[PDB]
Design a protein around this ligand. Structure first.
Ligand SMILES: *[C]C1=C([C])[C]=C2C(=[C]1)N([C][C]([O])[C]([O])[C]([O])[C]OP([O])(=O)OP([O])(=O)O[C][C]1O[C](N3[C]=NC4=C3N=[C]N=C4[N])[C]([O])[C]1[O])C1=NC(=O)[N]C(=O)C1=N2/[C]=[C]/[C]=[N+](\[C])[C]1[C][C]C2=C(OC(=O)N([C])[C][C])[C]=[C][C]=C12
Ligand SMILES: *[C]C1=C([C])[C]=C2C(=[C]1)N([C][C]([O])[C]([O])[C]([O])[C]OP([O])(=O)OP([O])(=O)O[C][C]1O[C](N3[C]=NC4=C3N=[C]N=C4[N])[C]([O])[C]1[O])C1=NC(=O)[N]C(=O)C1=N2/[C]=[C]/[C]=[N+](\[C])[C]1[C][C]C2=C(OC(=O)N([C])[C][C])[C]=[C][C]=C12
Lengths: 499, 494
């Protein structure tokens, strides 16, 4: 019933917000729609897998907030396997490699690939993390899809195909679905292309021992009966002295402030009194989440390692159900597994099949890519199609179609009277990730502490000390990477010498 | 409590559905979120205006369903004033004209304009009204915005600027916001460019005497206590023998079937048990409504008529708050008024101002365009910003961003167990309009009648006889319009 702050949503962001407020001495209640906490994180446990992350899983250097929170809760990380060679599978053939970027030998194609990644980062540098709409060319870039940008930038099909896969994998959406400004912001606010795509030294370096679901679970353990499961929020009334929050199961909660820690669009599931301001009212109808099925195929042994493959496959082409895999074997070396994502339109297309049919297609793909008949002998399979989730809307996160971020972006974390906004979508560093969830939850919590006069304004946004356990190597470039011309750049250089 | 069919939403679509089912002998309940019916239609009455449509207003030839429904309810139409000249205001100057399309004199620009409109219709002919995702080039066209298409098609800035205005005015969204496939479908399913843009012999020919809100009001009068106002639906449970529908004010309704007659995205405001199928679950997060403020400035007299202007203004350019106006004077010739739309990003931008500040900006614009100081002396002002509406989401209708229609379009009117889908967005002829609202409401109603075994399958979709009061003249083209080359076509010929 009565409390200081109601947190709507018991994902990492809501739980981090609730914990901070609780630790500060406030009376908090977490209202969670599902019969579980964790939201877009979910760790399944059974005898066949021991544990497996079916939602958010990877953490890495520069994600210091999630690392710190998890460490405080008694959790540990381990390194995702990248000892052996990665595979880039292109036009029906596998090309093993090392280093984060799939290499190319053709001089023209090399210039094009180099320029593509470089340009993503160049453009990113013009985009403020906390205000992408303030980029000098914000409107121009927001009024273009990533498809248009790639069409302009990539002078080879090779680069365009890899760039497309990059977009699909990064934001679980098609290149034509998303704003170029938003996508460029998204990559930049994770630290750029190298950081976001890397396993070693990047976002995919690590996983939590026992699963990421433990973060939300262990905060629930700390909060006890303050977390209310199967309490979907249906109504928020701010017309009176205290804010009134009603749930579907007919309960009423009364608070001084509210934190909305749900995906922006899921705000639509709540009826507001008074109505939301016009800009937020429309914003929450313009911000869908991506489409993905996370699939884990289990094997007797990590047989790929014997062939000097680490388990990473970057698989181009329409025919492949999965465009990206990582070794998901336990740190102990047992429960051998390959994790793969079925992305964007393929998540829609292949959802029509049965679980067994998807398993078959994945095994046959992996057998081809790994050149290994052993891939046809799975021992177990788990999957989760996040498109079906009423209380997520999709995964990994919210994307912005062309035109939306410049028109509505400033609304995202603007308080509405006594409602403050958390959720990974409102983060400024690793938004879209568990890291961003922590940043946004704690920031929203501190906004309320400031509103209550408990902390000064300069304490709302707080820096995070670098993890001692997961130190971050700087992102470096070579002289040639910095200065080699683009394809059109080379052509202009030819034109001038000829004239 | 217990009934045959619960209709969620008391707009024209929900009301038309409820009326049909009621007339067939079923017990219907309409659950309406607001304290009024009509939804995206709203007629305000006061002494200063008598009545004024602040939402949907225009009807015209080929919209036979809304015309028939309104006639049955005892309503009449009158003709929007287009006796005198229209105005196209371009680069700070007014150019009066007659006919539906704003003309150009430069030969290259003429070819470009002619080709633009022609190409819109050419492309539309390949798009099935009832299945746009089945167009031969559906994916190619859906993966492009209208901005991209216009950049390809328009070889002159003149044509691109007019085409952009056309898009903004048609779908209250920016060219870069919307799918090319969806936009081309939208125009085609209204009968093409000429039909959609025309006052005389087109969508803007007429208004209802006394306001369009009377359609929903008069059906509410018929249904009596079956219409429940201030009953926002929050929960639908289909796990049991009868469907259970719960409202925000704590009431529970039990029915054999449900019609969802709300904008697709507003389905998000309802918690579903069991959860919606994946495709609908995501679809309803991908389909926003446009942005518009409808503004009506009142004057002592329709002074523009004295200068041989009808009141229609097509106003190019960023500076102009309003890109399009029509004479909104009563058929009797009193309550002289100009109706203007503030469109898309301008609705967002100018909402920051006060009502008085917007009035000043509109009056100064109209004075410039009409070349009349009289425009600076308004006697009254009414406006409505539809962006602020929790239970509409915007106006006029739902638009589809790139990639959405092909991936999710088939989901729109696919039943979910015992829930059937009405609402103008699900129509196949004048979707987006009051006409489409009627089509979809009656179709959804008949789906349920068929499910109950009361009518055969071939009766679900029903043709509509042409209105005797508002007959449609055919759309014609000239030989030169059909065969004159595009700009690139002329260049290839050279
Ligand atoms: C789903 C998912 C998946 C499948 C995956 C993933 C993910 C996801 N992610 C994301 C995460 O998870 C997120 O972010 C988080 O979790 C969020 O949180 P928050 O904010 O808190 O939210 P949520 O969870 O949702 O919560 C909410 C809550 O609430 C509730 N509700 C609702 N409604 C309501 C409620 N309540 C009451 N009432 C009402 N009304 C619900 O229920 C809930 O609970 C992630 N993340 C991280 O961190 N990590 C990871 O891993 C993840 N994942 C993924 C990712 C991937 N990635 C990374 C990828 C891989 C690779 C890559 C790349 O690379 C490349 O490209 N290459 C290599 C080529 C060259 C890049 C990029 C990307 C990537
Ligand atoms: C808003 C608006 C405005 C402002 C305007 C307009 C409109 C609108 N429109 C549309 C209409 O209105 C619609 O469609 C209808 O109404 C719809 O219906 P429905 O479907 O039924 O829906 P609604 O109404 O929304 O209803 C629903 C209901 O539900 C409820 N809810 C919600 N949620 C809920 C509920 N309940 C319970 N629960 C829950 N949860 C609500 O509340 C409601 O009630 C229109 N239409 C028509 O027809 N007409 C008109 O006029 C209109 N408007 C407009 C238009 C415009 N236009 C046409 C334009 C002008 C000119 C043009 C052109 O031309 C050109 O371009 N040029 C000349 C240049 C060269 C073209 C095109 C367009 C145009």
């Amino acid at each position: 019933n009565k409390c200081d702050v109601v947190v709507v949503g018991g994902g990492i962001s809501g739980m981090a917000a609730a914990k901070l407020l609780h630790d500060s001495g406030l009376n908090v209640v977490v209202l969670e729609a599902r019969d579980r906490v964790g939201g877009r994180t979910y760790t399944l446990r059974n005898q066949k897998v021991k544990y497996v992350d079916l939602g958010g899983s990877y953490v890495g250097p520069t994600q210091n907030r999630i690392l710190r929170l998890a460490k405080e809760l008694g959790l540990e990380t381990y390194k995702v396997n990248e000892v052996e060679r990665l595979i880039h599978h292109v036009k029906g053939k596998s090309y093993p490699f090392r280093g984060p970027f799939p290499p190319v030998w053709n001089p023209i194609t090399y210039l094009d690939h180099n320029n593509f990644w470089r340009t993503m980062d160049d453009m990113g540098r013009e985009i403020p993390s906390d205000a992408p709409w303030k980029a000098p060319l914000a409107e121009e870039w927001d009024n273009m899809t990533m498809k248009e940008l790639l069409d302009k930038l990539c002078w080879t099909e090779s680069a365009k195909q890899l760039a497309t896969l990059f977009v699909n994998l990064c934001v679980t959406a098609e290149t034509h679905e998303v704003s170029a400004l938003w996508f460029l912001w998204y990559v930049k606010q994770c630290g750029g292309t190298t950081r976001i795509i890397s396993t070693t030294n990047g976002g995919q370096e690590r996983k939590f021992v026992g699963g990421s679901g433990q973060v939300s679970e262990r905060i629930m353990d700390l909060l006890g009966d303050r977390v209310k499961l199967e309490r979907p929020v249906i109504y928020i009334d701010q017309t009176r002295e205290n804010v009134l929050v009603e749930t579907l199961n007919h309960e009423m909660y009364e608070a001084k402030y509210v934190i909305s820690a749900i995906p922006p669009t899921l705000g639509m599931k709540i009826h507001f009194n008074p109505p939301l301001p016009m800009m937020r009212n429309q914003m929450i109808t313009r911000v869908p989440l991506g489409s993905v099925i996370k699939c884990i195929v289990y094997y007797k042994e990590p047989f790929w390692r014997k062939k000097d493959y680490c388990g990473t496959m970057i698989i181009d082409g329409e025919e492949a159900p999965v465009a990206y895999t990582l070794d998901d074997t336990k740190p102990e070396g047992n429960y051998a597994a390959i994790m793969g994502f079925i992305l964007a339109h393929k998540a829609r297309k292949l959802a029509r099949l049965t679980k067994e049919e998807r398993l078959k297609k994945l095994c046959e793909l992996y057998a081809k890519v790994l050149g290994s008949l052993e891939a046809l002998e799975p021992v177990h399979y788990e999957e989760k199609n996040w498109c079906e989730e009423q209380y997520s809307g999709g995964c990994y996160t919210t994307y912005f179609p062309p035109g939306i971020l410049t028109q509505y972006g400033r609304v995202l974390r603007q308080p509405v009277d006594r409602i403050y906004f958390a959720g990974t979508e409102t983060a400024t560093h690793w938004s879209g990730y568990m890291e961003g969830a922590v940043e946004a939850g704690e920031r929203a919590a501190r906004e309320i502490l400031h509103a209550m006069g408990k902390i000064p304004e300069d304490e709302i946004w707080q820096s995070e000390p670098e993890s001692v356990d997961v130190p971050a190597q700087p992102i470096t470039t070579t002289f040639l990477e910095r200065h080699l011309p683009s394809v059109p750049g080379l052509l202009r250089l030819i034109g001038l010498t000829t004239i």
